Protein backbone atom coordinates (compact mmCIF):
# COMPACT_ATOMS: atom_id res chain seq x y z
CA UNK A 1 0.00 0.00 0.00
CA UNK A 2 1.00 3.63 0.52
CA UNK A 3 4.23 3.81 2.52
CA UNK A 4 3.09 6.99 4.30
CA UNK A 5 1.16 4.99 6.91
CA UNK A 6 2.29 1.46 6.03
CA UNK A 7 5.42 2.06 8.09
CA UNK A 8 8.97 1.80 6.78
CA UNK A 9 10.73 -1.31 8.06
CA UNK A 10 13.34 -0.71 10.73
CA UNK A 11 16.80 -2.13 9.99
CA UNK A 12 17.70 -5.42 11.65
CA UNK A 13 19.75 -4.37 14.67
CA UNK A 14 22.11 -6.68 16.56
CA UNK A 15 21.05 -7.74 20.05
CA UNK A 16 22.22 -10.16 22.72
CA UNK A 17 18.99 -12.17 22.32
CA UNK A 18 18.78 -12.72 18.53
CA UNK A 19 20.71 -15.87 17.65
CA UNK A 20 20.79 -19.67 17.69
CA UNK A 21 23.26 -20.25 20.54
CA UNK A 22 22.41 -17.44 22.95
CA UNK A 23 20.73 -16.63 26.25
CA UNK A 24 19.11 -13.59 27.79
CA UNK A 25 21.60 -11.11 29.25
CA UNK A 26 19.77 -11.33 32.56
CA UNK A 27 22.58 -9.53 34.33
CA UNK A 28 20.72 -6.47 33.00
CA UNK A 29 17.18 -7.74 33.67
CA UNK A 30 17.85 -6.94 37.33
CA UNK A 31 18.40 -3.43 35.93
CA UNK A 32 15.47 -3.56 33.52
CA UNK A 33 13.16 -4.19 36.46
CA UNK A 34 14.37 -1.01 38.15
CA UNK A 35 14.12 1.06 34.97
CA UNK A 36 10.56 -0.19 34.42
CA UNK A 37 9.36 0.27 37.99
CA UNK A 38 10.90 3.71 38.52
CA UNK A 39 9.11 5.44 35.61
CA UNK A 40 6.46 3.09 34.16
CA UNK A 41 4.79 2.35 37.52
CA UNK A 42 1.85 4.75 37.19
CA UNK A 43 1.80 4.59 33.39
CA UNK A 44 0.90 1.01 32.37
CA UNK A 45 -0.35 -2.24 33.90
CA UNK A 46 1.81 -5.25 32.85
CA UNK A 47 -0.51 -7.21 35.17
CA UNK A 48 -0.30 -10.64 33.54
CA UNK A 49 2.71 -12.41 35.05
CA UNK A 50 3.32 -13.47 38.66
CA UNK A 51 6.27 -13.13 41.04
CA UNK A 52 7.16 -16.84 41.13
CA UNK A 53 9.12 -16.34 37.89
CA UNK A 54 10.79 -13.15 39.19
CA UNK A 55 12.95 -15.16 41.62
CA UNK A 56 16.20 -16.74 40.44
CA UNK A 57 16.48 -14.74 37.20
CA UNK A 58 16.19 -11.10 38.36
CA UNK A 59 16.10 -11.18 42.19
CA UNK A 60 17.55 -13.83 44.47
CA UNK A 61 15.49 -14.32 47.65
CA UNK A 62 14.65 -11.23 49.72
CA UNK A 63 13.89 -8.05 47.77
CA UNK A 64 10.85 -9.76 46.23
CA UNK A 65 9.51 -10.30 49.75
CA UNK A 66 10.37 -6.69 50.64
CA UNK A 67 8.29 -5.57 47.65
CA UNK A 68 5.48 -7.90 48.75
CA UNK A 69 5.50 -6.36 52.23
CA UNK A 70 5.68 -2.85 50.73
CA UNK A 71 2.19 -2.91 49.18
CA UNK A 72 -1.35 -3.64 50.37
CA UNK A 73 -3.45 -6.22 48.53
CA UNK A 74 -7.01 -5.91 49.95
CA UNK A 75 -7.27 -9.08 52.02
CA UNK A 76 -10.43 -11.04 52.73
CA UNK A 77 -12.85 -9.41 55.20
CA UNK A 78 -12.73 -10.52 58.82
CA UNK A 79 -15.56 -12.17 60.77
CA UNK A 80 -17.26 -8.75 60.96
CA UNK A 81 -17.13 -8.36 57.17
CA UNK A 82 -15.11 -5.14 57.35
CA UNK A 83 -12.45 -4.53 54.69
CA UNK A 84 -8.79 -4.49 55.70
CA UNK A 85 -5.32 -4.25 54.17
CA UNK A 86 -2.63 -6.94 54.13
CA UNK A 87 0.92 -7.42 52.87
CA UNK A 88 1.31 -9.08 49.50
CA UNK A 89 2.34 -12.66 48.85
CA UNK A 90 5.07 -14.21 46.72
CA UNK A 91 2.53 -15.84 44.36
CA UNK A 92 0.50 -12.71 43.53
CA UNK A 93 0.56 -10.62 40.35
CA UNK A 94 2.22 -7.25 39.69
CA UNK A 95 -0.34 -4.63 40.81
CA UNK A 96 -1.17 -1.27 39.29
CA UNK A 97 -2.27 2.16 40.52
CA UNK A 98 -5.61 1.87 38.72
CA UNK A 99 -8.21 -0.22 40.60
CA UNK A 100 -8.84 -2.43 37.59
CA UNK A 101 -8.92 -0.11 34.56
CA UNK A 102 -10.95 2.99 35.48
CA UNK A 103 -8.16 5.31 36.64
CA UNK A 104 -6.22 4.78 33.39
CA UNK A 105 -8.56 6.25 30.77
CA UNK A 106 -9.41 9.17 33.08
CA UNK A 107 -5.84 10.46 33.40
CA UNK A 108 -4.27 9.56 30.04
CA UNK A 109 -6.04 12.51 28.33
CA UNK A 110 -6.99 10.12 25.55
CA UNK A 111 -6.62 6.40 24.85
CA UNK A 112 -5.75 3.39 27.10
CA UNK A 113 -2.27 2.01 27.86
CA UNK A 114 -1.85 -1.38 26.17
CA UNK A 115 -0.75 -4.27 28.37
CA UNK A 116 3.03 -4.44 28.00
CA UNK A 117 3.13 -8.15 28.89
CA UNK A 118 2.61 -9.01 25.20
CA UNK A 119 3.53 -5.87 23.21
CA UNK A 120 6.82 -7.52 22.19
CA UNK A 121 4.89 -9.92 19.94
CA UNK A 122 1.85 -7.65 19.53
CA UNK A 123 3.56 -5.77 16.66
CA UNK A 124 5.43 -6.74 13.52
CA UNK A 125 9.20 -6.61 13.62
CA UNK A 126 9.89 -7.62 17.20
CA UNK A 127 12.71 -6.74 19.58
CA UNK A 128 13.99 -3.91 17.38
CA UNK A 129 10.49 -2.55 16.68
CA UNK A 130 10.02 -1.07 20.16
CA UNK A 131 13.58 0.28 20.10
CA UNK A 132 12.96 2.04 16.79
CA UNK A 133 9.58 3.35 17.96
CA UNK A 134 11.06 4.80 21.17
CA UNK A 135 14.20 6.16 19.48
CA UNK A 136 13.39 7.39 15.97
CA UNK A 137 10.81 10.05 16.81
CA UNK A 138 12.23 13.59 16.52
CA UNK A 139 11.29 16.47 18.81
CA UNK A 140 9.60 18.32 15.92
CA UNK A 141 7.15 16.99 13.30
CA UNK A 142 7.92 16.96 9.57
CA UNK A 143 7.39 20.21 7.70
CA UNK A 144 3.79 20.86 6.68
CA UNK A 145 2.20 18.42 9.16
CA UNK A 146 0.18 20.15 11.90
CA UNK A 147 -0.60 17.53 14.53
CA UNK A 148 -3.69 17.80 16.74
CA UNK A 149 -3.12 20.10 19.73
CA UNK A 150 -1.53 17.99 22.43
CA UNK A 151 -0.19 15.14 20.27
CA UNK A 152 3.37 14.12 19.43
CA UNK A 153 4.91 12.49 16.34
CA UNK A 154 6.70 9.25 15.47
CA UNK A 155 7.66 8.46 11.86
CA UNK A 156 8.56 4.80 12.40
CA UNK A 157 5.24 3.87 14.00
CA UNK A 158 2.40 3.55 11.45
CA UNK A 159 -0.06 6.24 12.48
CA UNK A 160 2.17 9.29 12.85
CA UNK A 161 0.78 10.35 16.24
CA UNK A 162 0.41 8.76 19.68
CA UNK A 163 -0.84 9.76 23.15
CA UNK A 164 2.61 8.87 24.53
CA UNK A 165 4.15 11.47 26.77
CA UNK A 166 7.79 11.48 25.66
CA UNK A 167 9.17 10.63 29.11
CA UNK A 168 12.61 9.50 27.97
CA UNK A 169 14.83 12.29 29.32
CA UNK A 170 18.14 11.03 30.69
CA UNK A 171 20.35 11.90 33.70
CA UNK A 172 17.92 10.63 36.38
CA UNK A 173 18.45 6.87 36.55
CA UNK A 174 21.93 6.32 38.06
CA UNK A 175 21.60 2.92 39.75
CA UNK A 176 25.10 2.46 41.16
CA UNK A 177 27.30 2.88 38.06
CA UNK A 178 27.94 5.17 35.10
CA UNK A 179 25.89 3.03 32.70
CA UNK A 180 22.61 5.08 32.77
CA UNK A 181 21.84 8.66 31.60
CA UNK A 182 22.02 7.70 27.90
CA UNK A 183 18.95 6.61 25.95
CA UNK A 184 20.55 3.51 24.41
CA UNK A 185 21.22 1.72 27.71
CA UNK A 186 17.73 2.19 29.16
CA UNK A 187 16.14 1.39 25.79
CA UNK A 188 18.04 -1.90 25.62
CA UNK A 189 17.16 -2.66 29.24
CA UNK A 190 13.44 -2.06 28.75
CA UNK A 191 13.27 -4.01 25.49
CA UNK A 192 15.11 -7.00 26.98
CA UNK A 193 12.87 -6.97 30.05
CA UNK A 194 9.74 -6.75 27.90
CA UNK A 195 10.99 -9.63 25.75
CA UNK A 196 11.66 -11.70 28.87
CA UNK A 197 8.20 -10.94 30.26
CA UNK A 198 6.61 -11.89 26.93
CA UNK A 199 8.63 -15.15 26.91
CA UNK A 200 10.13 -16.21 30.26
CA UNK A 201 11.49 -19.47 28.84
CA UNK A 202 14.13 -18.41 26.29
CA UNK A 203 17.11 -20.10 27.99
CA UNK A 204 15.23 -23.34 28.70
CA UNK A 205 13.61 -23.28 25.26
CA UNK A 206 16.98 -22.91 23.52
CA UNK A 207 18.62 -25.61 25.64
CA UNK A 208 15.81 -28.09 24.96
CA UNK A 209 15.86 -27.11 21.29
CA UNK A 210 19.60 -27.71 21.04
CA UNK A 211 19.21 -31.15 22.60
CA UNK A 212 16.27 -31.93 20.31
CA UNK A 213 18.01 -30.83 17.11
CA UNK A 214 21.10 -32.84 18.07
CA UNK A 215 19.11 -36.01 18.76
CA UNK A 216 16.95 -35.63 15.63
CA UNK A 217 20.02 -34.96 13.45
CA UNK A 218 21.62 -38.14 14.79
CA UNK A 219 18.41 -40.10 14.21
CA UNK A 220 18.03 -38.67 10.69
CA UNK A 221 21.58 -39.65 9.69
CA UNK A 222 21.01 -43.08 11.25
CA UNK A 223 17.85 -43.56 9.19
CA UNK A 224 19.72 -42.44 6.07
CA UNK A 225 22.37 -45.09 6.59
CA UNK A 226 19.91 -47.90 7.35
CA UNK A 227 17.63 -47.03 4.43
CA UNK A 228 20.60 -47.00 2.06
CA UNK A 229 21.65 -50.30 3.67
CA UNK A 230 18.56 -52.50 3.49
CA UNK A 231 17.50 -51.07 0.12
CA UNK A 232 20.88 -52.04 -1.36
CA UNK A 233 19.62 -55.53 -2.19
CA UNK A 234 16.63 -54.16 -4.11
CA UNK A 235 18.22 -51.12 -5.81
CA UNK A 236 20.83 -53.27 -7.59
CA UNK A 237 18.89 -56.31 -8.83
CA UNK A 238 19.26 -56.77 -12.58
CA UNK A 239 16.80 -58.20 -15.11
CA UNK A 240 17.67 -60.20 -18.23
CA UNK A 241 15.06 -60.91 -20.90
CA UNK A 242 15.43 -64.09 -22.94
CA UNK A 243 12.69 -64.42 -25.59
CA UNK A 244 10.71 -67.65 -25.13
CA UNK A 245 10.53 -70.41 -27.70
CA UNK A 246 7.79 -69.79 -30.33
CA UNK A 247 5.13 -72.30 -29.31
CA UNK A 248 1.93 -71.40 -27.45
Amino acid sequence: MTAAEHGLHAPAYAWSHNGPFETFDHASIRRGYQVYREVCAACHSLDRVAWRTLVGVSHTNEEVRNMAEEFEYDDEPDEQGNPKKRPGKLSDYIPGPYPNEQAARAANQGALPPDLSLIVKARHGGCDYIFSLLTGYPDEPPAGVALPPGSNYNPYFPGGSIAMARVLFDDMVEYEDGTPATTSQMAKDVTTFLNWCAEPEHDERKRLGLKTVIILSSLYLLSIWVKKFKWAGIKTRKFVFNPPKPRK
Partner: peptide
Protein backbone atom coordinates in the same frame (compact mmCIF):
# COMPACT_ATOMS: atom_id res chain seq x y z
CA UNK B 1 5.09 -63.42 -18.44
CA UNK B 2 7.95 -65.82 -19.04
CA UNK B 3 11.60 -65.26 -19.89
CA UNK B 4 12.29 -62.67 -17.17
CA UNK B 5 15.22 -63.46 -14.87
CA UNK B 6 16.23 -61.47 -11.79
CA UNK B 7 19.57 -61.39 -9.97
CA UNK B 8 19.56 -60.14 -6.40
CA UNK B 9 22.34 -60.27 -3.80
CA UNK B 10 22.36 -59.67 -0.07
CA UNK B 11 22.99 -56.14 1.25
CA UNK B 12 25.50 -57.67 3.67
CA UNK B 13 27.86 -58.50 0.78
CA UNK B 14 27.93 -54.92 -0.56
CA UNK B 15 29.08 -51.42 0.24
CA UNK B 16 25.89 -49.59 1.31
CA UNK B 17 27.18 -46.21 0.08
CA UNK B 18 29.28 -47.43 -2.84
CA UNK B 19 28.34 -44.54 -5.14
CA UNK B 20 26.73 -41.76 -3.11
Amino acid sequence: QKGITSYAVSPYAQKPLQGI
